[PDB]
Ligand binder design. Structure first.
Ligand SMILES: *C(=O)[C@@H]([C@@H]1N=C(C(=O)O)[C@H](S[C@@H]2CN[C@H](CNS(N)(=O)=O)C2)[C@@H]1C)[C@@H](C)O
Ligand SMILES: *C(=O)[C@@H]([C@@H]1N=C(C(=O)O)[C@H](S[C@@H]2CN[C@H](CNS(N)(=O)=O)C2)[C@@H]1C)[C@@H](C)O
Ligand SMILES: [Cl-]
Ligand SMILES: [Cl-]
Lengths: 242, 244
């Protein structure tokens, strides 16, 4: 079942914001959200598209492994961490769009369309060329749809190799300590309103996994740390992390 | 290949705690090694719970362990470490150093396959003499800090003669710490059945642009000092500007 817990709206309104958190308790097969409507509204994925793009690139051999180096093209872009050589791990850490656009061009439109359909990722009616559609609004996805996709990835159930799925889950590693492991991907959609932040992923515990997907209003880049901070406040409230 | 560099200033991090030991570092990009004590870096000890790394690789490659979700049920014997008295999988068995799970792996692998695969891994002295389910606690096997690094470099590069999948699963199980600055994959040990009683910590630090392998051991006359395995290692990594 799904349970709506409107008490989590306080974690957004404390920051003069609005958003949705969606949680899924894998052991109990139960979901929770503050806003069932916004949980099911589709937003541009922005940098969260790094997950399916990386899976497809690895499965087709566009990317050999997580050590392959994608050289900087020497064009200075306005995110400083993009202006250097990357591998699949650092490209995900720094959300390096130009690396992902070269992956997409090599995948090509036909194989990209077929794979996203196989993954049941995003809307049926995608539009835009293969290096741009995932930046310019040609694909969108909801927080509940991000959870369903991430559950398939966690269980190695996507229609790509087990190896591809294991490598991308390695690249998603964000935090680990003696209490929990978080595998996740941030996003920040700026090209089309509403400007939003994403954080999608899961928390591994000794005896359970909690999937999460959040998006929130992001009128300026000043608020970007709230993607992780508000999510962690909800996880702490629900006793998932200490 | 390149000369080991000795840095005796690291001894201060041991003597601060009235302790003695060795830290060995390997800079992968530069193919350069560093230690406070070249002699002790080459001294071979029982691996104790550091053996969980090769034991898990062999169990996965032979199909004794299907994957990292397979549950190893508690046998119902109450042991003195409370976290052992519960069901485990390959991830939690490594986190809690659950010897009874690893002893079941070793019995299913058996003496012959265990001896052959440690030979294939070039692991320490390759000697499994003793009980098939305790030789890494009180039998003949011995490995040095430098030998631990040689083994871990092969694992990092998927160069051991087991499947790539087996190597990726064990590296997942070794995950110890991750933040925006670094990832540590590592395994603790504490050898208490045979003198000298020692602590171990072996593994690597992944940075954006390099990997630093480490192997440390130290005298551990009482369980008091077990946190020094990680704390002394991190003081050295901080001194060398590897972590903040
Ligand atoms: C993905 O969604 C986009 C990228 N994701 C970004 C992110 O890191 O969240 C970056 S924005 C980057 C963050 N660090 C720089 C400075 N932040 S600050 N000090 O101004 O608050 C800017 C980028 C948008 C992808 C689609 O571009
Ligand atoms: C592996 O080498 C041995 C195991 N390694 C352990 C470890 O924690 O490093 C456990 S010892 C663990 C720590 N806390 C309990 C002991 N007392 S305390 N709270 O002071 O640390 C249990 C175990 C020895 C394996 C061969 O047994
Ligand atoms: Cl990992
Ligand atoms: Cl063990």
């Amino acid at each position: 079942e799904w349970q709506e817990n409107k008490s989590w709206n306080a974690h957004f309104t404390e920051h003069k914001s609005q958003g949705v958190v969606v949680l899924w308790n894998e052991n109990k097969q139960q979901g929770f959200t503050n806003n069932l409507k916004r949980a099911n509204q589709a937003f541009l994925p922005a940098s969260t598209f790094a997950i399916p793009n990386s899976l497809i690139a690895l499965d087709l051999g566009v990317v050999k492994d997580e050590h392959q180096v994608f050289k900087w093209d020497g064009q200075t872009r306005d995110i400083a961490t993009w202006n250097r050589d990357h591998n699949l791990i650092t490209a995900m850490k720094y959300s390096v769009v130009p690396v992902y656009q070269e992956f997409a061009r090599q995948i090509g439109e036909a194989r990209m369309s077929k794979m996203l359909h196989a993954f049941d990722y995003g809307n049926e009616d995608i539009s835009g060329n293969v290096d741009s559609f995932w930046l310019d609004g040609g694909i969108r996805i909801s927080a509940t749809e991000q959870i369903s996709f991430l559950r398939k990835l966690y269980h190695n159930k996507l229609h790509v190799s087990e190896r591809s799925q294991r490598i991308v889950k390695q690249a998603m590693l964000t935090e680990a300590n003696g209490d929990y492991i978080i595998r996740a991907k941030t996003g920040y959609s700026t090209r089309i309103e509403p400007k939003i932040g994403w954080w999608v992923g899961w928390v591994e515990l000794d005896d359970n996994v909690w999937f999460f997907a959040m998006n929130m209003d992001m009128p300026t880049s000043d608020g970007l740390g709230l993607r992780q901070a508000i999510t962690k406040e909800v996880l702490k409230q629900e006793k998932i992390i200490p």
